[PDB]
Paper text:
Human ceruloplasmin (Cp) is a multi-functional copper-containing protein. Indeed, Cp oxidizes highly toxic ferrous ions to the ferric state for further incorporation into apo-transferrins, catalyzes Cu(I) oxidation and promotes the oxidation of biogenic amines (norepinephrine, serotonin) and synthetic amines (p-phenylenediamine (p-PD), o-dianisidine(o-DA)). The Cp molecule (∼132 kDa) consists of a single polypeptide chain with 1046 amino acid residues. Mpo (EC 1.11.1.7) is one of the major proteins of the antimicrobial system of mammalian neutrophils.
A re-refined structure of Cp at 2.6 Å was employed for construction of models, elucidation of additional details of the structural organization of Cp, and for comparative analysis. However, it was not possible to unambiguously trace the majority of interdomain linking regions most likely because of their inherent flexibility (these linkers have thus not been included in the present model). Domains 2, 4, and 6 contained one type I copper each. Three copper ions (two type III and one type II) form a trinuclear cluster with ligands provided by domains 1 and 6. The structure of Cp contains five disulfide bridges stabilizing the external loops between the β-strands. The S-S bridge between Cys881 and Cys885 is not the only factor that stabilizes the interdomain loop 885–893, but the end of this loop is additionally stabilized via H-bonds of Arg893 with Asp959 based on the our Cp structure. The H-bond network links two different β-sheets, but also restricts the loop end movements in case of proteolysis that results in cleavage of the bond next to Arg893. Another binding site was located in domain 4 of Cp near the side chain of Trp669. Amino acids in domain 4 of Cp localized in close proximity to the p-PD-binding site are involved in the contact. This binding site in the Cp molecule includes amino acid residues His667 and Trp669 and also Ser622, as demonstrated in the present work.
Residue numbers in the entry: 1 to 475, 483 to 885, 890 to 1040
Write the structure that this text describes.
Amino acid sequence: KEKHYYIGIIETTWDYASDHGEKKLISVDTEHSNIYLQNGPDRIGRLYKKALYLQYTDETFRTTIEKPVWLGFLGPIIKAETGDKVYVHLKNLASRPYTFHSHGITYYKEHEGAIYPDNTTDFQRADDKVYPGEQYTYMLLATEEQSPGEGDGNCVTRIYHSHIDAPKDIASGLIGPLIICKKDSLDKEKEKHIDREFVVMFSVVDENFSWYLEDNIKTYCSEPEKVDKDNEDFQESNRMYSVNGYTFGSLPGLSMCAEDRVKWYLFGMGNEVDVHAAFFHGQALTNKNYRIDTINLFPATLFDAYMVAQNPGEWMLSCQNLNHLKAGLQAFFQVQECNKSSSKDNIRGKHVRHYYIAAEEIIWNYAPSGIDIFTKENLTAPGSDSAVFFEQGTTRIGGSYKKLVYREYTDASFTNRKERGPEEEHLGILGPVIWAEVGDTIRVTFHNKGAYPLSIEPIGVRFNKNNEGTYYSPNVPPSASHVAPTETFTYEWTVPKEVGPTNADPVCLAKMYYSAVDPTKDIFTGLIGPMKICKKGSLHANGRQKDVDKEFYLFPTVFDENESLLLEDNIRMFTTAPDQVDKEDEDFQESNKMHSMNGFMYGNQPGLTMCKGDSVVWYLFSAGNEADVHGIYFSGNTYLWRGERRDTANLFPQTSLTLHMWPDTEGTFNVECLTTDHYTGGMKQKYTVNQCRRQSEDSTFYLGERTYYIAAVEVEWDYSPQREWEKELHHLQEQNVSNAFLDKGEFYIGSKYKKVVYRQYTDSTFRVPVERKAEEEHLGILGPQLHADVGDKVKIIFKNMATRPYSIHAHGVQTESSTVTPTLPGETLTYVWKIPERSGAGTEDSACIPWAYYSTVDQVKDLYSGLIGPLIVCRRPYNPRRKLEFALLFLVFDENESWYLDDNIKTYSDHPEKVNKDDEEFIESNKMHAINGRMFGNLQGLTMHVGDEVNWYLMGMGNEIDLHTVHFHGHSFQYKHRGVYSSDVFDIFPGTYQTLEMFPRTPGIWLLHCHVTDHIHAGMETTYTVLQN
Ligand SMILES: *[C@@H]1O[C@H](CO)[C@@H](O)[C@H](O)[C@H]1NC(C)=O
Ligand SMILES: *[C@@H]1O[C@H](CO)[C@@H](O)[C@H](O)[C@H]1NC(C)=O
Ligand SMILES: [Ca+2]
Ligand SMILES: [Cu+2]
Ligand SMILES: [Cu+2]
Ligand SMILES: [Cu+2]
Ligand SMILES: [Cu+2]
Ligand SMILES: [Cu+2]
Ligand SMILES: [Cu+2]
Ligand code: NA
Ligand SMILES: [O]
């Protein structure tokens, strides 16, 4: 059908915590809220003016249609079913220009609502700048191409926002939800067997970026003269950590019944600090028929989830990013009894597993050997990167910290202690494994031999209010939420089918438990452990999975000892001058950020050993804050996850993953974090795979043979050869702005740096480089796109025409040795990459998948210096439509880490003498936020036709900062085998390699960008062109 909405943009005053109390939130004392909510002489408080979308009954925009209270400031909910034509009648009643741009629906250029250089004419531009008092009516068509995929639910979450300066428009308040549904799955604007629909935007809503900042300062700050917009504390006080714009618990309206079938539409929004971990303390959810609880959201991440509300009472919805939790990213919801009126599991007291766990103080050395196992270098080597963390002296703790750690004892006295064996040598700091099967009951007798009160909070199991490990509320014998320094308490959790693995899940799921009297300090103090929840009849009496040789539990995180309950205690036991230590000095706190796996650093983790051919399950999980974006890479072997083949697992606060691996080659390999600073900081370990059988000789499995001649060449690389697109963008936006990254001013470098890049040659003489033709113009900085099929042996003849050692190696591929030999300058070496079945698609991948190739001599610096490329591995050779391929690398090139920094100062700075490599402004000037090493629409060659199929190969690498939410204007993509899932933003992080299918249908020049604020603004964007057929 054809549907009409009337949406006005008005200016209005918005309250971020409309009272009314009195609350206790997790990890938030009753005074902390003042930071953000307290009006003052130099602080705005909790009221702000902003621009919001409202719904109207009528073309005479006078009577509003009120929204549900839980929506907050979000625009009104728009819905559509496949086949529907939606007309959005916008009227702008604010003081400045805005638009309506919608994410998951098809439109011509007249109806995109976004301004940018696309060669359009006046009649396709009226949509892109709706002036005050002006009115524009947008035509949207819900096509099949944009429909939810066969593997999605009936409805998916999409958004709409203003898109002049989207970041600032959205910060100002113009963001709302657009729910797209299959036909005929809707009945009277609600989905057919769903009782409740809620939408929840998680975001650090940043009023510093609003168009109304100055109006707000002028209005509320009783001393406007004394405000410094760039003072860091003032900025914090305007960062409103919110769900739907509600802070500190004040989200009202989230009420439901026991039994109710609920659909949640979640999204993230904002900047680099918007690393969220949405958590329903409830409460168990499914996403895509998989059990989850936690969901991670980033700027523009679109997600949906299904919940049969159960376990009646007052619950918390929160962000488990500990920095967020403690700034109040928390909303209550309630499940009331109405009464039942259903039934089900039932199982309580039948199969009982009984654990006895104590909390106790130890001195944990994060690196017992005292050396870095990968380099054999002494950790305190003056000048080394490890020295920052392991140096000990007048104002510096070192490698070893007093911690609190869970440990297992034999029975209900605490006389004895279950000694750890070989199977648990790798656990390290982690507490004992809690394991249960669906249908079991779990009792945990917890005893506290520490000096602070503690608890145990499990993720992934069922527990009533009497057993909850955290305390919170909307309005001393020990309890679930509080076991004090000498006391003891026995928790009861259940594991019913509705909280355990579904048919689509694997046999066991990775979960975790931690103390949560204050989880923002307890975890880092050391109170974290692994859990494993499995299907009925899948484990042995001893806890081991039936047909599985090995099971490992990995918890990588940044152990922020600055947040440890034992910090002061540690300062007084380890520094040789305790009084001179400033607990606020940046350098000091870096020295206490311990980047580690199971509390181990610099290759010192023991006990990851296994036989070749072994069946191995890896249980990964993490915790922490925004710094915790991890890409755990298993060199030398791949794994399956949800039928996808990968070798690098992405993890965020409270993320957990179950990986299946069959290691296929003898050696000692690395398990390490790809994320640049984590690696440098010591997040790297070995795992050994031994030979325990024969030993055949050769299985003659070379269906295919290829050879490629590639060189590293030093080249002058320009991140922005032209500036016309940028000038036009900023002109269209009316922005007085200038460019930190590209403007030389007095002495900065600019857009051109000497780099080293891979390039293809025609033969072994290396004297004729291969012509890059039209369909490879888009590669930019990337090395050539190499192809291989499963079955192939790929010879890489590699010449180093550069001036220091380098190599070339690919993710995914199998080689004979775990070490990669460096190629010296002038040398040519041969590397052989075998492509067995495990180097290619899993059963649920598309036919072609991408893997990064890169140099291993110094993985951080060689990368930032320019050496990176895509290897595409395809399945099995065995109609009219043209198939295209594009590889895209989303990476912030950090020129401060290039081997060529010094040269680039001497060559490109007008006054090199005045450069200080350690100055924060110079540092920023060399962080080049690029796509394939080009910015601001300087990446050409993304050109295609209506009717084509396009495989996009998205790749991510880099640092903590390198979260990238890749978004294509005008079109959606599908992914997975047979295009089963569907969306228009894909999350990309370091180590994330994904293939997306696109079937372009709408002619136009369309914007392609990362949706993270700082990244758009720094030019991480280009356009792609769709031509008529
Ligand atoms: C826009 O127009 C110019 C001038 O006609 C053309 O040469 C240029 O390639 C166009 N831009 C794109 C992205 O197609
Ligand atoms: C590292 O060097 C110091 C002296 O510079 C020495 O005392 C220490 O034992 C060394 N560590 C190891 C593990 O060899
Ligand atoms: Ca337009
Ligand atoms: Cu958007
Ligand atoms: Cu968050
Ligand atoms: Cu990491
Ligand atoms: Cu980005
Ligand atoms: Cu868009
Ligand atoms: Cu956009
Ligand atoms: Na404030
Ligand atoms: O979009």
